[PDB]
From Swiss-Prot, chain A:
InterPro entries: KH_dom, KH_dom-like_a/b, KH_dom_type_2, KH_sf_prok-type, Ribosomal_S3_C_sf, Ribosomal_uS3_bac-typ, Ribosomal_uS3_C, Ribosomal_uS3_CS. Binds the lower part of the 30S subunit head. Binds mRNA in the 70S ribosome, positioning it for translation. Plays a role in mRNA unwinding by the ribosome, possibly by forming part of a processivity clamp. Pfam families: KH_2 (PF07650), Ribosomal_S3_C (PF00189). This is Small ribosomal subunit protein uS3.
Curated annotation (Swiss-Prot), chain B:
It comes from Escherichia coli (strain K12). Keywords: Ribonucleoprotein, Ribosomal protein. Belongs to the universal ribosomal protein uS14 family. PROSITE patterns: RIBOSOMAL_S14. The gene is rpsN. This is Small ribosomal subunit protein uS14.
Curated annotation (Swiss-Prot), chain C:
Part of the 30S ribosomal subunit. Contacts 16S rRNA. Cross-links to the P site tRNA and weakly to the A site tRNA. The lineage of its organism: Bacteria, Pseudomonadati, Pseudomonadota, Gammaproteobacteria, Enterobacterales. The C-terminal tail plays a role in the affinity of the 30S P site for different tRNAs. Mutations that decrease this affinity are suppressed in the 70S ribosome. InterPro entries: Ribosomal_Su5_D2-typ_SF (IPR020568), Ribosomal_uS9 (IPR000754), Ribosomal_uS9_bac/plastid (IPR023035), Ribosomal_uS9_CS (IPR020574), Ribsml_uS5_D2-typ_fold_subgr (IPR014721). It comes from Escherichia coli (strain K12). This is Small ribosomal subunit protein uS9. GO terms for biological process: cytoplasmic translation.
UniProtKB/Swiss-Prot annotation, chain D:
SUPFAM superfamilies: Ribosomal protein S10. The gene is rpsJ. Part of the 30S ribosomal subunit. Can also form a heterodimer with the transcription antitermination protein NusB. Binding of S10 to NusB is mutually exclusive with its incorporation into the ribosome. The rRNA transcription and antitermination complex (rrnTAC) consists of RNAP, NusA, NusB, NusE (this protein), NusG, SubB, ribosomal protein S4, DNA and precursor rRNA; S4 is more flexible than other subunits. Gene3D superfamilies: Ribosomal protein S10 domain. PROSITE patterns: RIBOSOMAL_S10. Belongs to the universal ribosomal protein uS10 family. Keywords: Ribonucleoprotein, Ribosomal protein, Ribosome biogenesis, RNA-binding, Transcription, Transcription antitermination, Transcription regulation. GO terms for biological process: cytoplasmic translation; regulation of DNA-templated transcription elongation; ribosome biogenesis; transcription antitermination. This is Small ribosomal subunit protein uS10. It comes from Escherichia coli (strain K12).
Amino acid sequence: GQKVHPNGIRLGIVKPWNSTWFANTKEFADNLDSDFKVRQYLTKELAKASVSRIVIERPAKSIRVTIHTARPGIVIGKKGEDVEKLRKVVADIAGVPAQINIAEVRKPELDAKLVADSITSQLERRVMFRRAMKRAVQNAMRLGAKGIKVEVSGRLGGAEIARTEWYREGRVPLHTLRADIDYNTSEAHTTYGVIGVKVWIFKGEI
Amino acid sequence: AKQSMKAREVKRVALADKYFAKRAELKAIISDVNASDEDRWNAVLKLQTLPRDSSPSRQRNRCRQTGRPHGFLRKFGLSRIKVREAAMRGEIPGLKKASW
Amino acid sequence: NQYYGTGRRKSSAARVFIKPGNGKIVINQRSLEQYFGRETARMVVRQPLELVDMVEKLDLYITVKGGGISGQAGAIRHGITRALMEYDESLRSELRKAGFVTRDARQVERKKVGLRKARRRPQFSKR
Amino acid sequence: RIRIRLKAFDHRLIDQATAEIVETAKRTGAQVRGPIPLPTRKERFTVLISPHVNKDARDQYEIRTHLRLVDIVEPTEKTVDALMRLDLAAGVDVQISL
Amino acid sequence: RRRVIGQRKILPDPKFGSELLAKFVNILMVDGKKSTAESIVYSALETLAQRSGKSELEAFEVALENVRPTVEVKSRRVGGSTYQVPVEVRPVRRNALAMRWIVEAARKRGDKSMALRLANELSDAAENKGTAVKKREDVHRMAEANKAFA
RNA sequence: GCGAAGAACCUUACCUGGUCUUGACAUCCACGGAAGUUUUCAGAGAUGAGAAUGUGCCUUCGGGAACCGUGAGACAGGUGCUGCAUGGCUGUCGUCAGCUCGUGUUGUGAAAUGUUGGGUUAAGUCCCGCAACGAGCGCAACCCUUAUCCUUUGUUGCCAGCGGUCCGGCCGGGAACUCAAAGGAGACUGCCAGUGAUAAACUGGAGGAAGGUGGGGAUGACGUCAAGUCAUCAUGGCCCUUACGACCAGGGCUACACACGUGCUACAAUGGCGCAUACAAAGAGAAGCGACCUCGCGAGAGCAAGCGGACCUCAUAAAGUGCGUCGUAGUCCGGAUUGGAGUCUGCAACUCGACUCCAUGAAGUCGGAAUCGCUAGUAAUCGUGGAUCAGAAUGCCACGGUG
RNA sequence: ACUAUGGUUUUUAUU
């Protein structure tokens, strides 16, 4: 029964929307179409740059896209000024002039999306990923976790055989809405399957 | 479903722009013999009767990620079967959750 | 001595005010003769209060809005009894023998998913 | 001579924008009428709960659209000249009428 | 099972009077119009008082004295044995059960006017002249033997 | 009324006849043209041939990009086959009290123990005592809603007190009330009396607007059927290639011997008819919602203000009330297949769609065995809006009265 | 007191 989204229940609690702007309902559908297009235009233009999250701000005659990265240096790029390709990519598609805005990720080895990406980069090569899962769990309890969990499941061959693998420490309270728990999925998209990974990190209640 | 719709859209949006979307108020004067002494309507009637394919009929817009005949949210433009990962994650402005 | 109270029931909202004077009743700023009801006048404001006497040596003012007109009478009865239950230490419990000082909390219970209207449980019937 | 409108989808964000309007238009000339809250156009936004073979349950979202008029009485176009230049953060729509 | 909410205690009325008269104007309510029974309550009695009883004060007392259920019948089993069993009815609502058996028949019979469909029913109830009561009694009479068990 | 928010065409799987072959659509590697507009014939159309017409962007002027078209091979493509195949998504046991593991203990071992046994509960809930002692998921709580008291600002919402006033918040003014939204406060088995290894834990009472997981939601513990779904979205392997692919036109889905599922309106007379007469509430809305007013028996169609919506409009509350009248009748009530003329969208409603006006008229006397659903604002009952949409639903999703 | 019959084969990890 149920289980329609692991974050859809918790993500309104003290959390502003991932896009902020106002439009009248008779103007809204094209204003939202352009809001998905600015994500898609970013993901075809920026790769491997340690980005965890992006947030959309569309104030009057303006667009701002907050980019959260573990490596500000590889987003701000060459000489600290290779930002214009990354700034202008959203401007003509959004229909408004664009600014640049970068943010640095707090404890990147304690962030479930970037830990998942470290494992995805080794699942897309089918080697060292099991070591990376083990080490992510060992280190998270020394970085600030009160518990951590990973899972890889189903096929990974070669052979037809199905295998699950985790490594796990402490607690992962999903249903406690004060748990402040982090969750992300990631996929490797290989000639041997979709090859997904699931990551949960718990730092503590409130 | 198949990805067949753009090969029709590319001819049918122009068919609508030329023979439908700017031809609706024309109907209120094109056949009126008292509202014109100038010969101006007979020729554009012969042009307007040329197309025979779609416009108001035989043609529905359909969703963009899949050309499904239904599930298009009119005042949002998205398919109700390809929106949950955005809707749940707070990516549509003004929608709130949970329990009310 | 002067008395006041408010009361609600199923879209009806009422207020009642009471003064010393001659037995006169005002409802929606007009005298009680300018009102219409399908039952006999001045009952719902008098009968619950004959334990202290009513409407013979008191000057009344009543206002009511919304809901059904016999539901409005219920809201007025709740208002006038709640306005005067402080008149004695036992009157608060003598009015509970009738139950008019308890609030009629009826106001559309919220819908359950996937069920049609309020809480009514699902029905699959045959087989 | 003129009047304004402010729209948002959140009660705390429309307050966070009202805090800028009173600071941008209602101090010179000093204008003293306080902000009425107005209706929020409460509605449920609904879609089928699952993408396949279920049509019986729907997913429930809360929609509100807040309105503030804030009230201005000074007739000069100078009353809005800074409000048509200053923030006003992202997430709200302002409108100048008459 | 055992819970179940506590069964209700009903009410009297400030005009209709007793708990049973307050039930008469509220039982068999259909279409919810709630103004039909207040012209039919204690309004079939003046002709009853000259057809199957006396006075408008005893015309309905005698109806619920002639219609008087004292026993109910129901199946009971204990393993591989089944019996139709008789049980004495509790007195406190006994006259309200009898009332129901009259006011429903005025709905389930459709002959002439509603100004007749109840008055014509009451004039046989005040005499214990109900439909098919000989075969009704034939069940309770047959079940009497099962108060001796197996 | 499942896959699928509307079956004329279109949808749609199916059938037929046309037609295309590196393919409608993609990359790879080459070679030209801007994207493309205008127009005539032929062809069911897809197209097949002609005749006019355009030269946008970046250029170091070399050629090129997006984009269009044509190739040689690898290939593209598939409502083809399969969830006893995979990623995903669901259906169901399950708001039930359950699930599982470490350390000690027992046993030759699978396994046991813990989770037992006594009290208690909604409860693997709490307490006690045992060769057991502990720990996590589910429970319970965090989230969310509601009857109540307090508080904040007053237009397009309200008006007690106070001054004026046909005596309308209207004008001076004002939050006692209402509306709007928010934030605080109230309730805790706390207090009492009993019941109970005075343990752990129930029952009842007072005071209260509210009483005992506060009431009600959000939920869904491993596993089970080794369930369904490739045709909601992806995809492997086999299989199809001048094609099972995909560009079109014409046909199929109300094709018929009857059964099976689920609903609608009646069979009334507390009803039917005639006549008079009252109150909304929530919603949607600019080639819009359309007032007042006309024209047409009428569906509708016109003229022409208000308003981009707490404002104006859709718009009219019905049930009811109350006086006359008929009188349980296969007709008096009920309305199906009719007879006639009208209203409408669109390329077009002959055949598969809806509406209206005036006559006619069949079945229908509460239903077979059997078996299905419940509990206060619930059943039944009567009004309104909106979504889907070229056009059309007693369906779907919301609002309110009588109860 | 409703209950007799029910063809074949059946799933996870190993050096």
